[PDB]
A paper describes a structure:
Unlike the dissociated systems of individual enzymes that make up type II [name] systems in plants and bacteria, Type I [name] systems in fungi and animals are large complexes that integrate the key enzymatic activities required for fatty acid biosynthesis. In particular, yeast type I FASs are 2.6 MDa hetero-dodecameric complexes with an α6β6 configuration, which form a cage-like structure comprising two dome-shaped reaction chambers on either side of a central platform. Along with structural support regions, enzymatic domains form the walls of the reaction chambers, with most active sites facing the chamber interior. The mobile acyl-carrier protein ([name]) domain tethers the growing fatty acid chain and carries it between active sites, so each can act on this in turn.
[name] density was weak (only becoming fully apparent when inspecting the map at a threshold of approx. 1 σ) and poorly resolved, as was also the case for previous EM density maps of S. cerevisiae [name] (e.g., EMD-10420, EMD-0178). In an attempt to improve the quality of the cryoEM density corresponding to the [name] domain, we performed focussed 3D classification within the reaction chamber of the complex. While classification with a regularisation parameter (‘T’ number) of 20 did not reveal any meaningful classes, using a higher value of 40 (i.e., putting a higher relative weighting on the experimental data than on the prior/reference) yielded a class containing relatively well resolved [name] density. Particles from this class were taken forward for asymmetric reconstruction, yielding a complete [name] map of 3.1-Å resolution. In the latter map, the additional density is consistent with the [name] domain of the α subunit of [name], given the fit-to-density of an [name] domain homology model. Ultimately, the new density was of sufficient quality to build an atomic model of the [name] domain. Interestingly, [name] domain residue S178 (which tethers the growing fatty acid chain) is located ~ 18 Å away from the KS active site, which is in agreement with the length of the phosphopantetheine arm (18 Å). Focussed classification led to an improvement in the strength and quality of the [name] density that was sufficient to allow atomic modelling, probably as result of grouping together only subparticles with [name] domains in the same relative position (adjacent to the KS domain, as has been observed in several other yeast [name] structures) at the time of vitrification. Use of an expanded mask for focussed classification revealed classes with putative [name] density in other positions within the complex interior. These classes contained relatively few subparticles, suggesting that the vast majority of [name] domains were adjacent to the KS domain, with the remainder either missing or occupying other positions.
Author numbering: 139 to 299
Write the structure that this text describes.
């Protein structure tokens, strides 16, 4: 069941996080310059977080849509955690979660309750990153409806259990 991350599960997530939009809400099949409109600050900031650890920069950003970037990047993507792509995960993990909820106790619960594996537990924090709560969760038991619903949206992908 275990397989590494696809760039359409790690970087299509990130460009939906900057627009504060949903997964189906972006058209997914058009270029970055046409996505944001004419804001021209987030457009240079999308290439800011698309160029940190990711073999940093492609041959040209604004010619490919959100798939046709990633089909080029699969031979360059080693299945990394993310330096500051994956640091937005820790931002959710400290600002919106109760006291005593760093990534040690979370990654235990993703395996010992549902069963995902470390190759698939990267791609379930990112579907937690697109739907963040508006406030910090006031109890440890609030991770039983927030974090469990991320694996149910992950069940709309490969669909294991």
């Amino acid at each position: 069941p275990d397989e590494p991350v696809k760039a359409a599960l790690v970087l299509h997530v990130l460009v939906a996080h900057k627009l504060k939009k949903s997964l189906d809400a972006v058209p997914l099949s058009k270029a970055i310059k046409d996505l944001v409109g004419g804001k021209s600050t987030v457009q240079n900031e999308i290439l800011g977080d698309l160029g940190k650890e990711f073999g940093s920069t492609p041959e040209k950003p604004e010619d490919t849509p959100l798939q046709e970037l990633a089909e080029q990047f699969q031979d360059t993507f080693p299945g990394s955690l993310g330096k500051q792509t994956g640091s937005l995960v820790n931002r959710l993990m400290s600002s919106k979660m109760p006291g005593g909820f760093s990534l040690s106790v979370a990654r235990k619960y993703l395996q010992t309750r549902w069963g995902l594996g470390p190759g698939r537990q990267d791609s379930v924090l990112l579907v937690a990153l697109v739907n963040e709560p508006g406030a910090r969760l006031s109890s440890d038991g609030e991770a039983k409806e927030f974090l469990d619903s991320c694996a149910q949206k992950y069940a709309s992908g490969a669909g294991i259990t």
